[PDB]
Design a protein around this ligand. Sequence first.
Ligand code: HEC
Length: 360
Amino acid sequence: SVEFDFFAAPQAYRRVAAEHRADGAFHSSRGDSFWVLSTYEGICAAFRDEDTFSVSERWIPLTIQGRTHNEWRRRLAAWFTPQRARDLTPAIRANARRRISAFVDRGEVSFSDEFARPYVLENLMLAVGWPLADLDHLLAINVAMIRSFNAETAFPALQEYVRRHVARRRTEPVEGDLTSATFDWEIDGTPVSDADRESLLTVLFLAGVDSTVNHMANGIQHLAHHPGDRHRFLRDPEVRPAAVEEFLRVNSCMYPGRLATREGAGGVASQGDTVLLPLALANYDPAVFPEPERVDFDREQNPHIAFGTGHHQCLGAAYARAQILTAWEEWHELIPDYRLPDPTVEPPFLRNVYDLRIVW
Ligand code: HEC
């Protein structure tokens, strides 16, 4: 066992795994203790076997499993398809262009604070049906949560907001609006409760901004430091979708948890153990991704699981992809050449509280 803190950065996960993993996992004695799976095949299998690796608070749909979870996903699917993402892409594109245009003349920006976070949140609000006049309010909630408004009142403010949104749509339902649609939903033969409605809307808010923003930021930070890759992205548009997938692989950092239900789970765990599924290890397994630390837009096999796999695979994957690609497209139209302030120091992986300054 090792005294390993699961709040560690991806690089730390990978170093600890390199030194301590055997049989596809290492064990942490920290806190209540937990296993960390370290292989692509083992993590994929765990995501795909909920009878062995359980997800079971009530956060819809993240913490429910079985037939009720499948029914929630069926009801939600229409608002999160690739076709819906395409339908919304002219709005996403105009959003990116408007925002980047407003700071091109400065020659600098704090990428995530001034651009990516309000961009992504605006896009989320459009998809979910939250009035865009509320963006500044919701942005303040989101920022207070990152910087943990403040730690005490941020989440209560979000809870009041979703309660008020439900009440707005119940008074004036809108055809095609997600919240309005849920007033007609049944799950397991029972009308959806306002408590589950509020849970769903809360999960969408908490899931739908930060991961997208930080993938946008870590990707542009790499391009700003690597002129060869920047030039490739700029001059070879056909490679851009592959580049987005390669950055999703490389910049993965979530570590979804599961509860082992049986002896020998994953080859290593026992009944009652917490098991973590770090995407920073799955997506860097050299058995599947040779030279895993290398950003290679031409990587021939990129079966990454940046969005998970199995039944809980990210609902927002198509929408996140559209936002990242579109933002980087519009960025390179207006700002084809750019750099980090000191372009020859190795920058850190961006997570939690950071300030990504780009100049041009
Ligand atoms: C517009 C909403 C939205 C966006 C954008 C979004 N997500 Fe998700 N994500 C969700 C929801 C909702 C779930 C829960 C799905 C479920 O439990 O069935 C989820 C689940 C996941 C999971 C699985 C967690 C588990 O326990 O299995 C991963 C991993 C994930 N998202 C990664 C990402 C990444 C990476 C991005 C952006 C680069 C992203 N998500 C963007 C809504 C979103």
